[PDB]
Every structure is written in structure tokens, then in C-alpha cells.
């Protein structure tokens, strides 16, 4: 019943919304603008209430806004309403788009939740406390403050990758995942711009979760700045460091570091007092493995021949992925068996393969 | 844009020669003036301090 009343309520809202007298006045304000008008890009600004512009055809005319909307709403080098006469700024014009930055996984409150990934919790506190904790922002207030970022280690797809979005999901900020090998280019200086573009986003879309994976390459100080040593290595990293060592947060924009090559990196690349956090994924001990086991093992359908301990003890200290991985091809064997309920044998097989 | 013209009034065949600055009616493509080569770019960022006064007493020993 009330659904009807709810629907028309939604409807009446649409009406008033569309109802934006003022309409004429608004149209009067449109009837001002005339039409059709001309796109054109900003360049600089003065209080002049005249400013000149930028065009692909490149007329650049010194022009006023039609003033109700604002100059300060916009930045130099931005497309603006222009007439076709003088290309008069008609007002605030987006120039919305900018849907690109260098190489990233563009995602927010991502799929991975710490529940999902198999129990890693011992280090989840690390990532939770350093980030998720100030993400609540409540206690961190009294805490007086929160580190910048963390450093993952161990294996991706179990420790490194799975954890990565866990708190990223949990805090529900903008999770930005990248690889340094997803930077460069071998050329000099946009590696920074890559970061910049990223940091543009990072600065822009805050809160966000910065992620970084496998700095094997852009991060190695070597011993030398010369004799074949590619500047861009440091040249990038330093700038990445500049925005890194130029920012830590109280719980807004959070960083993640995922890689196995550790001291390839500068100490201030960590800059303790800022990055306090090393996550390192290990082979989960039989219990902790069992912790992840029961998760992925059970979520895999199977026949009661299967047992965790049947799998648990038989193991070499696998990765928490190999859990998944054994579990993975395990059913694949049952698929090669063309069955929907997996035996215990496939598991041992699938593991002793993988 | 290339136009022919009977050589215009304000110019001299010696003034005339390829690669030159010339006043030309833009519309008519009628050459008005010969122009000296002057604002042929000084890449004005090119910094000419004209013969500034500095001694050899400025930095000795040399």
C-alpha cells in the first residue's frame, strides 16, 4: 500500500526537481547565454572578468565569464563555455572527463575481505591497525594520530594480493593498485608523472588506498647514478618517494607495498616514522593453514573421504594459495572425472602437483 | 600563399630577393613595404646585455 504512496512520493520529488518564475528566470539566465556556443580551453586567469582561452583551432580571445557561475570554480588550462563571437566565456564548463592515469587497478572497497582470503589475521592486525583502525577515525582521534602505508611480503594471490584488498574493502576508500613494472617507459620523468597522475587521483579522490606491487625495477638505488645505471629507476622512485615522503595521513589516503625485493629500496623510501609496517606472508602453519584450508577446502564441494588433516599433515608448508590451488585443480580432476562432488584423492593429486 | 604580382610600387628589385620581410597588403596580396630583417626571431629569450661595463678589476688573478 504505502509502496504506492512511496512511489508517488518519488514521483512528486521528480516533479519539483524538474520544476527548477525561477524557471523563466533560469531560462532568462539561459536566454542570456544564447546558443549554440563554443567549447574552448582555459589558459590563465586574472580578476579582469576577462580572460583568454585555448583552442584546438587556437583562437585565444580575452573574454569575460557570463557571470553567475564562477572563475574560481575552474583552473587554467580547462575547457570553458565560449560564444562563437569573441569566444566569450559563457560560464563554468566541464571539461569533466580526465578518465585516465598511468597503470592502475581502479577499485574501491574491493571484493577482497579478510574473511574471504583465508585466515591470515596475525598480520591483518598490522594492516588493520595501521590503516583500518584510523579508518574508523574515531579512536585515532584520541590516538593523536597513524602510519603511512604498510609493506606486504610473502606470496601474492595468498598473502600479498589477498590481504591487499581485505582492508581495502574494509575501510572502503579508493583502492589504487599498481606495479612499478607497470611503470616505465625506460624514458625519464613521467614515471613521476605516472605517480603524479596517480597522486593527482590520490590527492583528488581521497580517501583512497594506494597499493603498490613488486618494485623490482623502478626502486633499485643500485650503487650508482652513472655508468649505464638508468636514471629513471631512481628518477621515478624519488618522485614516488616525494609524494610518498611528502605525505602521510591520519586515516585518509593509505598506501600498500607488495614485493619480495626489500633492501633494493631506500630507508627513507620506507621513511620510518611514516611507514612502520612490514607485512610478510609465510607459509601458514598447519593450524593457520587449516584455518585457510577449512575455508577454501569446504567452499569446495567434496566427498567425506576428504579431511583437512588428511590434507593438513600431508603438506610441505604450502602457500595459502596452494591450499586454494590444490583445491583448485582438485575439482578440475573431479571435472575430468565429470563429477560435482570431489573425492579425497583428487586433493592429494592436485596438491602433489600443486 | 603564393601570388604573382607585377612588382609593386614601393619596392626595389635589389630590395627584392628571396627570403625577405616585406610589407604586403594582406587582402590584395599587394606588397606594400619591403621590410628589414629585424624581428626575424631574436628568440627574444636570447639575452643581449649590450656591452655591459665590467672591469678587469672585477675578479683578479686571471
Amino acid at each position: 500500500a504505502t509502496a504506492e504512496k512511496l512511489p508517488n512520493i518519488y514521483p512528486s520529488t521528480r516533479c519539483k526537481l524538474k520544476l527548477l518564475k525561477q524557471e523563466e528566470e533560469k531560462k532568462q539566465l539561459e536566454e542570456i547565454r544564447g546558443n549554440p556556443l563554443s567549447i574552448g580551453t582555459l589558459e590563465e586567469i586574472i580578476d579582469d572578468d576577462h580572460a583568454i582561452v585555448t583552442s584546438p583551432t587556437m583562437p585565444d580571445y580575452y573574454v569575460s565569464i557570463l557571470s553567475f557561475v564562477d572563475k574560481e570554480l575552474l583552473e587554467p588550462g580547462c575547457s570553458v563555455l565560449l560564444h562563437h563571437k569573441t569566444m566569450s566565456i559563457v560560464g563554468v564548463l566541464q571539461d569533466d572527463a580526465d578518465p585516465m592515469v598511468s597503470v592502475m587497478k581502479m577499485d574501491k572497497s574491493p571484493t577482497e575481505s579478510y574473511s574471504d582470503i583465508g585466515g591470515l589475521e596475525s598480520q591483518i592486525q598490522e594492516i588493520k591497525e595501521s590503516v583500518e583502525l584510523p579508518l574508523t577515525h574515531p579512536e585515532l582521534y584520541e590516538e593523536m594520530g597513524p602510519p603511512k602505508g604498510v609493506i606486504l611480503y610473502g606470496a601474492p594471490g595468498t598473502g600479498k594480493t589477498l590481504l591487499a584488498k581485505a582492508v581495502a574493502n574494509q575501510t572502503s576508500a579508493t583502492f589504487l593498485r599498481i606495479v612499478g613494472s607497470e611503470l616505465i617507459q625506460k624514458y625519464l620523468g613521467d614515471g613521476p608523472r605516472l605517480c603524479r597522475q596517480i597522486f593527482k587521483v590520490a590527492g583528488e579522490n581521497a580517501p583512497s588506498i594506494v597499493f603498490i606491487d613488486e618494485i623490482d625495477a623502478i626502486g633499485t638505488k643500485r650503487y650508482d647514478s652513472n655508468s649505464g645505471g638508468e636514471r629513471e629507476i631512481q628518477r621515478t622512485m624519488l618522485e614516488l618517494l616525494n609524494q610518498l615522503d611528502g605525505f602521510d595521513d591520519r586515516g585518509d589516503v593509505k598506501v600498500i607495498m607488495a614485493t619480495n625485493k626489500i633492501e633494493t629500496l631506500d630507508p627513507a623510501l620506507i621513511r620510518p616514522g611514516r611507514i612502520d609496517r612490514k607485512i610478510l606472508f609465510e607459509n601458514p602453519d598447519l593450524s593457520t593453514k587449516k584455518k585457510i584450508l577449512g575455508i577454501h577446502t569446504s567452499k569446495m564441494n567434496l566427498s567425506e573421504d576428504v579431511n583437512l588433516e588428511t590434507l593438513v599433515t600431508t603438506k610441505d608448508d604450502l602457500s595459502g594459495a596452494d591450499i586454494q590451488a590444490m583445491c583448485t585443480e582438485a575439482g578440475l580432476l573431479a571435472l575430468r572425472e565429470r563429477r560435482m562432488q570431489v573425492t579425497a584423492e583428487d586433493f592429494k593429486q592436485a596438491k602433489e602437483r600443486v | 600563399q603564393t601570388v604573382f604580382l607585377p612588382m609593386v610600387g614601393l619596392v626595389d628589385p635589389d630590395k627584392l630577393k628571396p627570403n625577405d620581410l616585406v610589407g604586403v597588403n594582406k587582402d590584395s596580396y599587394l606588397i606594400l613595404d619591403t621590410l628589414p630583417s629585424e624581428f626575424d626571431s631574436r628568440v627574444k629569450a636570447m639575452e643581449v646585455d649590450e656591452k655591459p661595463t665590467e672591469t678587469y678589476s672585477d675578479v683578479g688573478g686571471l
Binding site: - | 630583417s37 626575424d40 636570447m46 649590450e50 678589476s57 672585477d58 675578479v59 683578479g60 688573478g61 686571471l62
Partner: protein, 176 residues
Amino acid sequence: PQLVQMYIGEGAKLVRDAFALAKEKAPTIIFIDELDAIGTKRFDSEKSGDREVQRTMLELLNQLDGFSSDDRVKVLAATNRVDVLDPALLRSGRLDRKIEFPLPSEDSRAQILQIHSRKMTTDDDINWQELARSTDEFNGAQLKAVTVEAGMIALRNGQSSVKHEDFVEGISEVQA
């Protein structure tokens, strides 16, 4: 750096630009700082890597090649040290004279510090040679730096005049 451009041979154009209008203002001394900027052709057929800095040199060389007798055109190129050599880089009508600028001797520094100490208010606790001796191979301004620092020092000393100790303290301000 201006001769260093995105446009292809922009520099050469610039160089030509630099050449010509200067040839009007000639007699002209064209000063060039750190020629090695444009002073490396590399070794190779990869030279388009920087064709600019090269050809601009080459263009310049050709300009230096274009004339001999014009003293109207004077060409002055400084580097810390040159990289590549050319008998263009040493030539009558091209760069002729390879001119050393050795970091001065001490009395020479005492000579230069003089000029720097010159405009300074001083009580003449000064002895230059001392300073000059204590100093090593300062291109003028390090003396001037000492001169500079000694002054700030001398103010920190309250002294309107600057004294030897002040300069000693400019030196004392780590010269390495």
C-alpha cells in the same frame, strides 16, 4: 638550453637567429656557457639522438666555418671542461683559443677576495694572504662567500666593520 629545443633544428634556426641579428650588432662577443651542452656529437650514426645539440654545434661550426676575418663576430664558449674536441673547436675563424681558467692562486685569491672584501666595511684585522692561504682554489665567489659569511658573522659580532676573524669565520663556515 635555449639552443636545446623540441623543434627539429630549432636550435640551428636559433643558432642562425643567434648568428645573424648578432652579426648586425657585430662587433659582437657571443658568450656560450657549458658548450658541452651542445658540445657532444657522440660517436655515432645514432647522433639524431640529439641532432639538436649536435647539429646546432654543427650549424654553429658551419657558422664558425662560414667566416674567418670577422672580428665583428666574437665567439666565447665556457665549460668546466670540454668533452669532444674539434679543430673547429680549435681553429682560426672558428674557436681558435683554448683558454684555461685555473682556480686561482692565493695571492690571486687575496687579489680576488680584495675585490670582494672591497665593498665591505672593514676594521683591517684583515690579512688577505692568510685567508688566501687558508683558502684553496676558490673561484672568486667562495672568497665572496667568505666575504658574504664574514659579514653576516660580523653583524652577529655586531661589527659594522668586518675583521680578519670574521673572514676566518667565513672560512670557518664550512668550506669543506
